[PDB]
Amino acid sequence: DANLYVSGLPKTMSQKEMEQLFSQYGRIITSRILLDQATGVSRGVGFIRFDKRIEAEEAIKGLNGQKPLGAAEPITVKFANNPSQ
Numbered sequence: 001d002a003n004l005y006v007s008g009l010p011k012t013m014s015q016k017e018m019e020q021l022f023s024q025y026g027r028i029i030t031s032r033i034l035l036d037q038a039t040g041v042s043r044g045v046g047f048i049r050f051d052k053r054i055e056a057e058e059a060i061k062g063l064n065g066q067k068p069l070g071a072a073e074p075i076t077v078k079f080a081n082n083p084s085q
Contacts, residue, residue: 002056004048005080006063008072009033013046022048022077025062026055044072047080 004022019031033046050056056079065075 001082001085002050002053003080003082003085004050004056004060004077005045005082006048006075006077007045008065008067008074008076009035009044009046011035011044013044015046018046018048021063022050022059025059026050026052028055048077 006018009018013033013035015031015033018033019028022028022031029049029051031046031048034043035045036042048056048059050059060077060079063075063077065077067074067076
């Protein structure tokens with residue numbers, strides 16, 4: 001599977017806003033930003049499932065930003081270990 005896990009996103013991170021950012025890297029399959037504050041929890045992260053793992057790898061490099069000790073403010077699009085993989 002070629003899923004993605006970009007955490008440390010701003011509140012302006014929209015689901016489709018994340019789909020156009022990774023869509024330009026390669027036709028994405030299913031994308032969405034995990035961040036809720038009413039019926040779940042405020043995640044702030046955003047996953048991205050590319051069709052091929054090479055599309056999520058080459059992109060994870062052209063998008064990933066950085067993450068200091070307080071990893072949470074900056075961006076970090078790293079493969080999602082996925083708790084069900």
